[PDB]
Short mmCIF file of all heavy atoms in Angstrom, two decimals:
data_model
loop_
_atom_site.label_atom_id
_atom_site.label_comp_id
_atom_site.label_asym_id
_atom_site.label_seq_id
_atom_site.Cartn_x
_atom_site.Cartn_y
_atom_site.Cartn_z
N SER A 1 -11.42 -107.73 -113.29
CA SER A 1 -11.65 -106.61 -112.36
C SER A 1 -10.69 -105.48 -112.62
O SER A 1 -9.58 -105.70 -113.14
CB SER A 1 -11.44 -107.05 -110.88
OG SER A 1 -12.23 -108.17 -110.58
N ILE A 2 -11.09 -104.28 -112.18
CA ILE A 2 -10.26 -103.12 -112.21
C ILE A 2 -10.20 -102.55 -110.77
O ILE A 2 -11.26 -102.36 -110.11
CB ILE A 2 -10.83 -102.04 -113.16
CG1 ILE A 2 -11.01 -102.59 -114.62
CG2 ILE A 2 -9.96 -100.77 -113.14
CD1 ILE A 2 -11.90 -101.68 -115.47
N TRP A 3 -8.99 -102.32 -110.28
CA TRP A 3 -8.77 -101.76 -108.94
C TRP A 3 -8.38 -100.32 -109.06
O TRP A 3 -7.33 -99.99 -109.62
CB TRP A 3 -7.67 -102.58 -108.23
CG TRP A 3 -8.13 -103.94 -108.02
CD1 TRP A 3 -9.05 -104.34 -107.08
CD2 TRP A 3 -7.82 -105.12 -108.81
NE1 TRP A 3 -9.29 -105.70 -107.22
CE2 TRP A 3 -8.56 -106.19 -108.27
CE3 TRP A 3 -6.99 -105.36 -109.92
CZ2 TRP A 3 -8.47 -107.51 -108.78
CZ3 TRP A 3 -6.89 -106.69 -110.41
CH2 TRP A 3 -7.63 -107.72 -109.85
N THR A 4 -9.20 -99.44 -108.50
CA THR A 4 -8.95 -98.00 -108.72
C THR A 4 -8.77 -97.23 -107.43
O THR A 4 -8.85 -96.00 -107.44
CB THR A 4 -10.11 -97.31 -109.48
OG1 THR A 4 -11.27 -97.27 -108.63
CG2 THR A 4 -10.43 -98.06 -110.79
N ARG A 5 -8.54 -97.96 -106.33
CA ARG A 5 -8.53 -97.35 -104.99
C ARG A 5 -7.44 -96.28 -104.85
O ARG A 5 -7.75 -95.16 -104.49
CB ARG A 5 -8.44 -98.41 -103.88
CG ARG A 5 -9.06 -97.94 -102.56
CD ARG A 5 -8.59 -98.75 -101.35
NE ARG A 5 -9.47 -99.89 -101.00
CZ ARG A 5 -10.74 -99.78 -100.59
NH1 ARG A 5 -11.34 -98.61 -100.53
NH2 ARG A 5 -11.43 -100.87 -100.27
N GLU A 6 -6.19 -96.60 -105.18
CA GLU A 6 -5.09 -95.61 -105.08
C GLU A 6 -5.19 -94.47 -106.10
O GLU A 6 -4.60 -93.40 -105.89
CB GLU A 6 -3.69 -96.26 -105.12
N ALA A 7 -5.93 -94.68 -107.19
CA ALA A 7 -6.04 -93.66 -108.24
C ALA A 7 -7.06 -92.56 -107.89
O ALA A 7 -6.94 -91.41 -108.32
CB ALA A 7 -6.42 -94.30 -109.56
N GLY A 8 -8.09 -92.95 -107.16
CA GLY A 8 -9.15 -92.04 -106.75
C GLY A 8 -10.15 -91.67 -107.85
O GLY A 8 -10.43 -92.46 -108.82
N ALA A 9 -10.69 -90.47 -107.70
CA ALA A 9 -11.71 -89.97 -108.61
C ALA A 9 -11.10 -89.52 -109.92
O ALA A 9 -10.05 -88.91 -109.95
CB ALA A 9 -12.44 -88.80 -107.96
N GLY A 10 -11.75 -89.87 -111.03
CA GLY A 10 -11.33 -89.41 -112.36
C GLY A 10 -12.18 -90.27 -113.35
O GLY A 10 -13.08 -90.96 -112.92
N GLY A 11 -11.92 -90.16 -114.64
CA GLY A 11 -12.80 -90.80 -115.65
C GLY A 11 -12.21 -92.15 -116.05
O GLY A 11 -11.02 -92.28 -116.35
N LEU A 12 -13.06 -93.18 -116.06
CA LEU A 12 -12.57 -94.49 -116.37
C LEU A 12 -13.20 -94.81 -117.68
O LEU A 12 -14.39 -94.53 -117.84
CB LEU A 12 -13.02 -95.45 -115.22
CG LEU A 12 -12.54 -96.91 -115.17
CD1 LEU A 12 -10.98 -96.97 -115.13
CD2 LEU A 12 -13.11 -97.60 -113.94
N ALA A 13 -12.42 -95.38 -118.63
CA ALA A 13 -12.97 -95.79 -119.96
C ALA A 13 -12.59 -97.22 -120.22
O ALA A 13 -11.43 -97.59 -120.08
CB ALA A 13 -12.48 -94.85 -121.07
N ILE A 14 -13.54 -98.05 -120.60
CA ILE A 14 -13.29 -99.47 -120.77
C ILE A 14 -13.80 -99.78 -122.18
O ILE A 14 -14.92 -99.41 -122.52
CB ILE A 14 -14.06 -100.30 -119.69
CG1 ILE A 14 -13.48 -100.02 -118.28
CG2 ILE A 14 -13.88 -101.79 -120.01
CD1 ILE A 14 -14.53 -99.85 -117.18
N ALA A 15 -12.97 -100.35 -123.03
CA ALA A 15 -13.41 -100.61 -124.44
C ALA A 15 -12.93 -101.96 -124.92
O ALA A 15 -11.85 -102.45 -124.49
CB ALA A 15 -12.93 -99.50 -125.36
N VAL A 16 -13.70 -102.52 -125.86
CA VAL A 16 -13.31 -103.78 -126.49
C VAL A 16 -13.39 -103.57 -128.01
O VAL A 16 -14.47 -103.15 -128.57
CB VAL A 16 -14.28 -104.90 -126.07
CG1 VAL A 16 -13.90 -106.17 -126.89
CG2 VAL A 16 -14.17 -105.13 -124.54
N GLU A 17 -12.28 -103.87 -128.72
CA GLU A 17 -12.22 -103.70 -130.13
C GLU A 17 -11.92 -105.05 -130.80
O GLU A 17 -11.05 -105.80 -130.33
CB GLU A 17 -11.11 -102.67 -130.49
CG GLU A 17 -10.98 -102.46 -132.00
CD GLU A 17 -9.96 -101.36 -132.36
OE1 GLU A 17 -9.54 -100.60 -131.48
OE2 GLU A 17 -9.60 -101.26 -133.54
N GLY A 18 -12.62 -105.36 -131.87
CA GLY A 18 -12.33 -106.64 -132.57
C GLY A 18 -13.28 -106.83 -133.72
O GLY A 18 -14.04 -105.89 -134.13
N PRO A 19 -13.37 -108.07 -134.20
CA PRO A 19 -14.13 -108.28 -135.39
C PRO A 19 -15.60 -108.28 -135.16
O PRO A 19 -16.35 -108.25 -136.14
CB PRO A 19 -13.68 -109.70 -135.89
CG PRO A 19 -12.91 -110.31 -134.76
CD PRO A 19 -12.34 -109.11 -133.97
N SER A 20 -16.04 -108.39 -133.93
CA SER A 20 -17.51 -108.24 -133.70
C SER A 20 -17.75 -107.25 -132.61
O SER A 20 -16.84 -106.85 -131.91
CB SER A 20 -18.24 -109.57 -133.40
OG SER A 20 -17.69 -110.14 -132.21
N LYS A 21 -19.01 -106.85 -132.44
CA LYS A 21 -19.32 -105.79 -131.52
C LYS A 21 -19.60 -106.37 -130.09
O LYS A 21 -20.48 -107.23 -129.92
CB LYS A 21 -20.55 -105.05 -132.16
CG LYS A 21 -21.07 -103.91 -131.44
CD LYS A 21 -22.35 -103.48 -132.19
CE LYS A 21 -22.96 -102.44 -131.40
NZ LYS A 21 -24.26 -102.02 -132.00
N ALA A 22 -18.83 -105.96 -129.08
CA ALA A 22 -18.87 -106.58 -127.76
C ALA A 22 -20.14 -106.09 -127.04
O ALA A 22 -20.55 -104.94 -127.23
CB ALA A 22 -17.63 -106.15 -126.90
N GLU A 23 -20.63 -106.90 -126.11
CA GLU A 23 -21.55 -106.43 -125.09
C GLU A 23 -20.81 -106.38 -123.76
O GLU A 23 -20.20 -107.39 -123.37
CB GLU A 23 -22.82 -107.31 -125.03
CG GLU A 23 -23.70 -107.13 -126.29
CD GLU A 23 -24.95 -108.02 -126.36
OE1 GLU A 23 -25.21 -108.81 -125.44
OE2 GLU A 23 -25.71 -107.89 -127.35
N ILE A 24 -20.81 -105.23 -123.09
CA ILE A 24 -19.98 -105.12 -121.93
C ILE A 24 -20.85 -104.74 -120.71
O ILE A 24 -21.67 -103.86 -120.82
CB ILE A 24 -18.95 -103.95 -122.08
CG1 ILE A 24 -18.17 -104.06 -123.40
CG2 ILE A 24 -17.94 -103.97 -120.89
CD1 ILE A 24 -17.21 -102.93 -123.60
N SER A 25 -20.58 -105.32 -119.53
CA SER A 25 -21.32 -104.91 -118.35
C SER A 25 -20.39 -104.66 -117.21
O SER A 25 -19.23 -105.10 -117.23
CB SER A 25 -22.40 -105.94 -117.95
OG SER A 25 -21.77 -107.16 -117.65
N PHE A 26 -20.89 -103.96 -116.18
CA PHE A 26 -20.04 -103.48 -115.11
C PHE A 26 -20.74 -103.65 -113.79
O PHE A 26 -21.95 -103.48 -113.70
CB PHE A 26 -19.83 -102.02 -115.31
CG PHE A 26 -19.34 -101.71 -116.63
CD1 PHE A 26 -20.21 -101.40 -117.66
CD2 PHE A 26 -17.94 -101.84 -116.89
CE1 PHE A 26 -19.72 -101.17 -118.93
CE2 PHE A 26 -17.46 -101.57 -118.15
CZ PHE A 26 -18.33 -101.24 -119.16
N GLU A 27 -19.97 -103.93 -112.76
CA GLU A 27 -20.47 -103.89 -111.41
C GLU A 27 -19.53 -103.01 -110.56
O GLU A 27 -18.34 -103.29 -110.45
CB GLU A 27 -20.50 -105.31 -110.86
CG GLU A 27 -21.69 -105.57 -109.97
CD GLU A 27 -21.78 -107.01 -109.55
OE1 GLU A 27 -20.95 -107.42 -108.71
OE2 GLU A 27 -22.68 -107.72 -110.08
#
């Protein structure tokens, strides 16, 4: 999880780097 309550509005970037290509999902 990522908690962003105190940070407020702004741009969030989530990435995975490695030897294969990740599939990433968000709720």
Side-chain angles (χ1 to χ4, degrees), residues 1-5 7-27:
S1 306
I2 303 165
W3 295 286
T4 69
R5 207 199 267 296
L12 186 57
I14 293 138
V16 174
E17 179 175 347
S20 61
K21 181 186 174 184
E23 291 177 0
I24 308 178
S25 61
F26 306 93
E27 217 174 72

